[PDB]
Amino acid sequence: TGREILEKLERREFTREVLKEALSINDRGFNEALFKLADEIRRKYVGDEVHIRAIIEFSNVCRKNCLYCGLRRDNKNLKRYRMTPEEIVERARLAVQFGAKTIVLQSGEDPYXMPDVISDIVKEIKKMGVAVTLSLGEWPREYYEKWKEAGADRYLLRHETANPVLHRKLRPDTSFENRLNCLLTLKELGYETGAGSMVGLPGQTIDDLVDDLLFLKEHDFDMVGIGPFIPHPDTPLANEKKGDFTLTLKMVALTRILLPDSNIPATTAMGTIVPGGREITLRCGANVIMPNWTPSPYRQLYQLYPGKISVFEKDTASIPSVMKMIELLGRKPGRDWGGRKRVFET
Numbered sequence: 001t002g003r004e005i006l007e008k009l010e011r012r013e014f015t016r017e018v019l020k021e022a023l024s025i026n027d028r029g030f031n032e033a034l035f036k037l038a039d040e041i042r043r044k045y046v047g048d049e050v051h052i053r054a055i056i057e058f059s060n061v062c063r064k065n066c067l068y069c070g071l072r073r074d075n076k077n078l079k080r081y082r083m084t085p086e087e088i089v090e091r092a093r094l095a096v097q098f099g100a101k102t103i104v105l106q107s108g109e110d111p112y113x114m115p116d117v118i119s120d121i122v123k124e125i126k127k128m129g130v131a132v133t134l135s136l137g138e139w140p141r142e143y144y145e146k147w148k149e150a151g152a153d154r155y156l157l158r159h160e161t162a163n164p165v166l167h168r169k170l171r172p173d174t175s176f177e178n179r180l181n182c183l184l185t186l187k188e189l190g191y192e193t194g195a196g197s198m199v200g201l202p203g204q205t206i207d208d209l210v211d212d213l214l215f216l217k218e219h220d221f222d223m224v225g226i227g228p229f230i231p232h233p234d235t236p237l238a239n240e241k242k243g244d245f246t247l248t249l250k251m252v253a254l255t256r257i258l259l260p261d262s263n264i265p266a267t268t269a270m271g272t273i274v275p276g277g278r279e280i281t282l283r284c285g286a287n288v289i290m291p292n293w294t295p296s297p298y299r300q301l302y303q304l305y306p307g308k309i310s311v312f313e314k315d316t317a318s319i320p321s322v323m324k325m326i327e328l329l330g331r332k333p334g335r336d337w338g339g340r341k342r343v344f345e346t
């Protein structure tokens, strides 16, 4: 019964069986109660501030070949670009001028910048008095250490899938083990660390999703980025099914319930598969939003999956747009850097 599962969730009986049933029940009333629970947990623990992380996708060059990703190295149908360090710093400055309190630098695994150009960029952005989050993929500890010494605050490295067999199949250059080692290293170096996963990957099962939730719980990540898998026509997964919005939303909601004080974005992928998906997600456990701040004529080339959100709007539309979103949700923009504010429990 759906009611028994919600009771257990409310009592924080976070067993595999409970999480599996939560993800297997498709009853609308159960789902809506789950979303309300997550929304209330979000309200109680992280409040009504929605933290804005302005993301600059500063290079779409990648040395890896992940099967799902439009930036994979084998995709020849893609103009590759690299912003210069000056362009990145000035674009970050413009986001700070627009009120962003966190700058996220994300890219393919582009060796050109690594590690020293990243360090120089981070140092310049940190002068602006904002948090800097990096999302550059898997690199040696030495690089992550240099970036931390340069002043980076946070690192996003979604674990993608906690199923090691699936992980290796989809990410043939690496492994779940490596991905986890990178995350443990990031945590060890003092980064606020983000993990997270895609929902609806080919061959991924409900049991895999439970394992994702249990993995996030085990490691108590500061941030959890979750979104559907969205097939990209220029990849081997082009003909696979897109991930389901409601299932993904349930993952976000259960992540909030499991990690009540975590920072959880309403991802662009969620707004891509369902119009208004980000706003729904903000009402079902998420408390972060990541407006796209990549400048034209690059923005349109950073296509991890085929997207329509923000591609045709102005270069600077996204931050004002998310501030309007936050207001029409009756929420507030983050007042500080929006670091995780741990509430220690039992």
Ligand SMILES: C[C@H](CCC(=O)NCCC[N+](C)(C)CCCS(=O)(=O)[O-])[C@H]1CC[C@H]2[C@@H]3[C@H](O)C[C@@H]4C[C@H](O)CC[C@]4(C)[C@H]3C[C@H](O)[C@]12C
Pocket: 031, 032, 033, 035, 036, 037, 039, 040, 280, 283, 284
């Ligand atoms: C907005 C729609 C439709 C609401 C509706 O059906 N009516 C609105 C009430 C206004 N009035 C009563 C005055 C209308 C007049 C007619 S009436 O005759 O009803 O008086 C309602 C119906 C189902 C609701 C979601 C679910 O809960 C799940 C979830 C819980 C979270 O916590 C918040 C997020 C989310 C997604 C909820 C959002 C929103 O809330 C929904 C979509």
Ligand SMILES: C[C@H](CCC(=O)NCCC[N+](C)(C)CCCS(=O)(=O)[O-])[C@H]1CC[C@H]2[C@@H]3[C@H](O)C[C@@H]4C[C@H](O)CC[C@]4(C)[C@H]3C[C@H](O)[C@]12C
Pocket: 096, 097, 098, 099, 100, 319, 320, 323
């Ligand atoms: C960037 C340019 C030129 C002047 C400038 O370079 N301004 C730096 C501001 C630096 N901060 C944002 C950190 C100030 C925060 C002070 S605050 O008192 O808001 O805490 C300024 C001039 C008018 C400013 C917009 C409007 O205002 C409306 C709106 C207010 C929201 O709020 C943030 C978003 C938005 C769109 C603003 C963005 C940006 O800012 C604009 C374009």
Ligand SMILES: Nc1ncnc2c1ncn2[C@@H]1O[C@H](CSCC[C@H](N)C(=O)O)[C@@H](O)[C@H]1O
Pocket: 068, 069, 070, 106, 107, 108, 109, 135, 136, 137, 138, 156, 157, 158, 160, 197, 198, 227, 228, 229, 230, 231, 232, 269, 304, 305
């Ligand atoms: N086709 C697709 N559909 C949905 N999300 C995707 C996707 N391709 C990639 N992503 C998501 O985009 C995230 C950022 S990829 C960019 C950062 C870095 N190269 C890295 O791999 O970590 C990935 O973690 C992945 O979960």
Ligand SMILES: C[C@@]1(C(=O)O)N[C@H](C(=O)O)CS1
Pocket: 055, 156, 224, 225, 226, 227, 265, 267, 268, 269, 270, 290
């Ligand atoms: C920035 C990111 C995230 O959840 O941190 N969101 C992106 C998106 O949903 O498109 C993929 S990675």
Ligand code: SF4
Pocket: 062, 063, 064, 065, 066, 069, 070, 071, 072, 073, 107, 108, 109, 137
């Ligand atoms: S997911 Fe990241 S590492 Fe994998 S191909 Fe895409 S950009 Fe490169």
Ligand SMILES: [Cl-]
Pocket: 053, 102, 104, 133, 154
């Ligand atoms: Cl962040």
